[PDB]
Design a protein around this nucleic acid. Structure first.
Lengths: 217, 115
RNA sequence: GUUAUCCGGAAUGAUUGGGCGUAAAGCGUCUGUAGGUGGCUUUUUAAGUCCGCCGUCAAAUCCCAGGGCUCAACCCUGGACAGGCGGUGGAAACUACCAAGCUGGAGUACGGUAGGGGCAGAGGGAAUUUCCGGUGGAGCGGUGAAAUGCGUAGAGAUCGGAAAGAACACCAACGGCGAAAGCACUCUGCUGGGCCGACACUGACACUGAGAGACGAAAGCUAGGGGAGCGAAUGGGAUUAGAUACCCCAGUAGUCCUAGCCGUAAACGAUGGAUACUAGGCGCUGUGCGUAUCGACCCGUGCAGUGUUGUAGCUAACGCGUUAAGUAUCCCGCCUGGGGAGUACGUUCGCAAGAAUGAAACUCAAAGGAAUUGACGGGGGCCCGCACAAGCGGUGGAGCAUGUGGUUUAAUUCGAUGCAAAGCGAAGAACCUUACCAGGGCUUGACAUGCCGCGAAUCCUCUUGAAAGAGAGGGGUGCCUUCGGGAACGCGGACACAGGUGGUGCAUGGCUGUCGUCAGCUCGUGCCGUAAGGUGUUGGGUUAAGUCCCGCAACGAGCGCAACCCUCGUGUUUAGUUGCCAACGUUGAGUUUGGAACCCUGAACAGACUGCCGGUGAUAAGCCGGAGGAAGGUGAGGAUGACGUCAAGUCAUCAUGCCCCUUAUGCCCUGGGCGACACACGUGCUACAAUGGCCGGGACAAAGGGUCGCGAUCCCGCGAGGGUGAGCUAACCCCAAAAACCCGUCCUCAGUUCGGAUUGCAGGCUGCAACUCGCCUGCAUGAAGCCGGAAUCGCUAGUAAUCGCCGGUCAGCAAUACGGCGGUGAAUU
């Protein structure tokens, strides 16, 4: 509704880089966005059947795609690399062919490497899948929001802010919840605040979480 | 603000911060030029006119700190424990009671010199 | 378990247990009978009271201890209790009775003081109105404006005189007096109360008080008088949608007097009277005293009377505060939910209008009081935005474009509609898009997965038909396996489902407008109040700004503001092509060698920070000017727009809850529709000219676009455009030769050598295809319109105004929509 500017969209020129950094000619630029969005929808969800399995349990932090000619970088930042890679080398093998069958035309030799994050309570993308995952299991809302505030402060941060929209605990009228601790400078560019947005399933309605994590100045 | 005023960081700091840091020092050396020397929480509080500074005695009785004052005629001695009935305006009256109170603190320590 | 019924909860009738300033509640104020209460001393009585005892208080319940039915219920012994009444023998302080007193209560006398206290009778001054006369002129009166009205049979105004009624300036005062109501020019007559002071005397003779008796602002009533002014009613004028109101001009009862009557009022300090006590600081009247009072005065001591940051205490709070709702005593009145009601009925009173006493049924679950936050206010104080003002241009008039209602239609699809709707979502609807209508068709079905059969899949297909489709024709059949079988794909079949721009965004996610770029919104600790909360975020100044300084129980901090980021304006460093090119050799075209200096270009760096000087200002902040500088006071201008307001908009972007349709609001195709009309409204464009039009010549721009593309040169056509076709994938090629402007000439203000709407005829171009629906060219026609009512909009500088160009959308709807670029260049504050 009447909120502040996107801290990932305001800080696009400096500090925080793009989730996809490449170059293409305006003739095959439209096909460049289609191939990068189709794989980002297939790696974030990552389920061939109609079940709630992989990718959403381990928590995806960032997906950086870099390309020049016929080769994509597709480096995924994960919290727990135990689910994506192996249980016996079969997990990353079916992911190597899934991205190959979709993107063809030219000889698309896709290499996918994996890197880790220091702590999952520093990045905004795990927090958007952790707190929103507590809405799926129907746990106490305001107790889960105050726990998401302290779990990031103990992970060494200078400020954190969390807020959703309406349809809380099965209420007919739409309300809003807001808890904040420390300082979060929403206007300044020398703040390097990261953002994420995730949707919830729910049989009564639909929720939408917004994460604001202030690192250094 | 005293340690960074006489260091090598003076030439690095911009003119926007150099005008605010000396303005903050100008307000911190005029008012806080008295309260500095000691750090601890007192057990006994001595004061001159407690009717003018009623905001100083009312905040000490709620914590449980014994109050002593140099009460005049325009004051009430009920909230005070041990009162000293004498003048508060004339400079001579303030000088006798306060220096002889300091001589009582210096007698229960070391060296009894002049005033 | 339900219902009925009593009690409890209800200290909501409270004797133990409550209240009456504002929540329900002191009767309007006095006098006073009965009744209640009553100072101090001694003696006495001892009635009340108290002690003990004797009777009676039936038994059985209840209670205590102890027994019997196996326990218990039940039954049972004794005791306790029966709180009471009477009698006898005592005690005697208190209350009461009797006797004799005392005095501080109360009362009286003596001598003085102040006062609108009251009644009666006189008399005084100003003014108003009216009557008469003089002078003199045409206006006067009145209102936010006007009109009714008074005027030349002459008012008003002015002067002289008369008549009459009422109230009586100043002094008047936060003043005084009175029981209340109430009462003020001066004087006289009769008369009441209060207070002080040396005292003299009685002696509690006191206080309160249902009923009762008396007094009662104004209005109103009866009879007789009076009547200047004011003024219910009433009559006109005006205002208004209407006003049988407010306002204007008149005006009766009444208001005034005598007598009688009615007895009511926010009859309010809304806090009944009387008495004794409890911190203080300023204002009246009497009296004592103060070197002889030498003085306006100084120090006490009484009455009555205000305010107080008024303390304790009391109070729900506001507030009261020794003239307390403080602490107590004596007695009387009154309340115990709101509406109905203070009405009905009855009694009493009255001439009447009505007054006094005072219900119920029914109905609601609430009324009410104080205070708090915020908002609102035709409340106030102080401040900021083109907000007004100052000023320029514009709209509404006109023709045309476009959007929306209404209307119409088979449909003229949907959504947005006060500002925050109205070229708005659709940056581009002839098919498509489209969702709507009509008609022709298919259904697990156009699209997804899974099972089975025939099969590779496809290409060219021929016939009918508007097409969607349907019937058959050949040509053709890759890659692996123990060939059984499969992947890719196709037709058909069965079933889950698939499918929905169907409803609900008052079920929702995401996102947005809006006040707002307004500048506020909050927290920690500590204090204030019982508390909800407040303080800090108030105040005095100051800025775009809780920006800053000072003051201040506030001290600090967080979000917002600012700054950090992007361009523009100066320079500097580095690097130079498709850029530029001073100096030097020139096919004059940087054109070539060459040169990097300058312009430009692209990354970095320097710089304004009120920082410096002066004045103003509270020796602060800040503002006003100046210096130095390309640039100053957030440099110009963007981006960025908090906690939140409107359950404002969007489930037709998408996603999602629920619901509904699912041989169907699902799906395919053809044609139509959305750019239909008697009208209305919004937003724009082109003109009414000649600071303009037209003809010819002619000087400079910035920013962007482009490979199913941008397209020069040349040829052809009057032109749009077409043929051929180079180069650029791009500061090397192209899209453009930018327009105002400027010189000369013509016209010379007549609806025109202004204006182009409209119309006919003939073409070009994009696409199956453009009649409805297109753009553009050529020829001709050539109106409305002469700057436009009420009302209303934007903008303060390089802005307004105006003149060209480019981009996105896109086959095509190219200067009229949106976005973007530059040229020229004000006005006023």
């Amino acid at each position: 509704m009447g909120q502040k500017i996107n801290p990932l969209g305001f800080r696009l020129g400096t500090t925080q880089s793009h989730y996809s950094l490449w170059f293409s000619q305006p003739k095959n630029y439209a096909e460049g966005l289609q191939e990068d969005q189709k794989i980002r929808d297939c790696i974030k969800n990552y389920v061939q059947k109609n079940t709630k399995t992989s990718s959403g349990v381990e928590g995806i932090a960032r997906i950086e795609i870099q390309k020049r000619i016929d080769l994509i970088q597709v480096i995924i930042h994960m919290g727990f690399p135990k689910l994506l890679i192996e249980n016996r080398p079969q997990g990353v093998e079916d992911l190597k062919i899934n991205v190959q069958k979709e993107l063809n035309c030219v000889n698309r030799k896709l290499n996918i490497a994996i890197t880790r994050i220091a702590k999952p309570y520093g990045d905004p993308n795990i927090l958007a899948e952790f707190i929103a995952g507590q809405l799926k299991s129907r746990v106490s809302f305001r107790k889960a929001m105050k726990k998401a505030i302290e779990l990031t402060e103990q992970a060494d941060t200078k400020g954190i802010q969390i807020q959703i929209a309406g349809r809380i605990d099965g209420k007919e009228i739409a309300r809003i919840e807001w808890i904040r601790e420390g300082r979060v400078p929403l206007q300044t560019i020398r703040a390097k605040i990261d953002y994420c947005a995730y949707t919830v399933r729910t049989i009564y309605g639909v929720l939408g979480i917004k994460i604001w994590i202030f690192m250094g100045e | 603000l005293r340690m960074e005023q006489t260091a090598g960081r003076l030439a690095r700091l911009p003119k926007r911060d150099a005008a605010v840091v000396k303005r903050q020092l100008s307000h911190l050396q005029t008012y806080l030029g008295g309260i500095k020397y000691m750090t601890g929480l007192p057990d006994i509080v001595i004061i001159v006119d407690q009717q003018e500074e009623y905001t100083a005695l009312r905040e000490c009785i709620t914590l449980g700190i014994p109050t002593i004052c140099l009460i005049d005629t325009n004051c009430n001695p009920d909230l005070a424990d041990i009162s000293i009935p004498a003048n508060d305006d004339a400079i001579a009256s303030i000088r006798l009671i306060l220096t002889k109170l300091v001589f009582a603190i210096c007698e229960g320590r070391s060296s009894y010199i002049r005033n």
